[PDB]
């Protein structure tokens, strides 16, 4: 059917979170490997995490991980690039974190009051970022992100994937 080969070295937590949220809805298997590959048909594949996240959310209709309207669709894209660039970075973390903090000031979830790709990719990156944790040791982390991060980290799915996959 639909198979995903992950890189068991630096696991794409975000994608695996995604797989877990679409399992009942879609039949998907995960295999160990040295790289990330989503096998869809005979020879159509996706290699970069953001393409895999988009295909999964597009196919898992029940899950509603890609929003409900063009606006939320575009917001979710914004957070995909945000996580793949500003957050996938050592420099200007502080500028980046503050930006995220401002956005979460009045939100519970990043987009549309329910879980979405945006929530997965940002959280996954935010976990695997050293600066975030250092802030965590220090207790210097911004208030909103801490709540949002904490809220997600406490959910069953976020702990199943964490337990099985998190290198640290």
């Amino acid at each position: 059917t639909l198979s995903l080969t992950v890189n068991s070295g630096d696991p794409p937590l975000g994608a695996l979170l995604a797989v877990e949220h679409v399992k009942d809805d879609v039949s998907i298997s995960v295999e160990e490997g040295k790289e990330n590959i989503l096998h869809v048909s005979e020879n159509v594949i996706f290699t970069d995490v953001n393409s895999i996240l988009r295909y999964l959310a597009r196919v898992a209709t029940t899950a509603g991980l890609y929003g409900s309207n063009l606006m939320e669709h575009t917001e979710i894209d914004h957070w995909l690039e945000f996580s793949a660039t500003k957050l996938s970075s050592c420099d200007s973390f502080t500028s980046t974190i503050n930006e995220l903090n401002h956005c979460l000031s009045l939100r519970t979830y990043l987009v549309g009051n329910s879980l979405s790709l945006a929530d997965l990719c940002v959280w996954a990156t935010l976990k695997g970022n050293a600066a975030w944790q250092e802030q965590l040791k220090q207790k210097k982390a911004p208030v909103h992100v801490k709540r949002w991060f904490g809220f997600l980290e406490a959910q069953q799915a976020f702990q199943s994937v964490g337990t099985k996959w998190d290198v640290s």
Binding site: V44, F46, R58, N69, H73, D77, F82, S105
Partner: protein, 204 residues
């Protein structure tokens, strides 16, 4: 399509406001704007923000009846990355010309199955994440990929022009050149089009 069901609780789309840096003009957006005009009645206006001085003349005149479907305001402003918002003020603007491009093109309503929609997205991602700031080794790799796919199809994502074509083409223009022939052909395919054509002229 042409529908206006775009924002679920808020009113239907009317005015789009874009902030862009003039040291870094967004050719994709200029091109897309021209494209929208063919299919929509647009009110276009350029502002310059307080924080900017001496915006070049070409940049100022880059847009120069009874009622409008869409309003398009470009504000030249000192921003690190391009932004989009739907009201005079907002909290989380959509950043990044790639994301702004997907949204605008979508207003045309040309739907795609999950695989094609994701491939279209993937190309847009390559232009932004690899081709835009990439090393020559990276640039060469991209060219290679396009060439392979442009021998399968006349357009990057299939038989029709997508936002994949617009974005990657525009990025190409603003960045040592060895160019495959499918790519060199596909360039021509694009330049033939009026919208692509005029916008290129504005950057001079």
């Amino acid at each position: 399509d042409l529908n206006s069901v775009l924002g679920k609780d808020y009113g239907a789309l009317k005015d789009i406001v874009i902030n862009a840096n003039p040291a870094s003009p967004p050719l994709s957006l200029l091109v897309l704007h021209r494209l929208l005009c063919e299919h929509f009645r647009v009110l276009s206006t350029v502002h310059t923000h307080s924080s900017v001085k001496s915006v070049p003349e070409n940049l100022l005149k880059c847009f120069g009846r009874q009622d409008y479907q869409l309003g398009f305001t470009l504000i030249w402003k000192n921003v690190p990355k391009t932004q989009m918002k739907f009201s005079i003020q907002t909290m989380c603007p959509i950043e990044g010309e790639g994301n702004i491009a997907r949204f605008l093109f979508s207003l045309f309503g040309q739907k795609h199955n999950a695989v094609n929609a994701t491939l279209i997205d993937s190309w847009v991602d390559i232009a932004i994440f690899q081709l835009k700031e990439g090393s020559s080794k990276e640039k060469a790799a991209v060219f290679r990929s396009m060439n392979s796919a442009l021998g399968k199809s006349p357009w990057l994502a299939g038989n029709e022009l997508t936002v994949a074509d617009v974005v990657l083409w525009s990025v190409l223009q603003q960045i040592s050149v060895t160019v495959p022939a499918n790519v060199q052909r596909w360039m021509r395919s694009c330049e033939n089009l009026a919208p692509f054509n005029t916008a290129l002229k504005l950057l001079k």
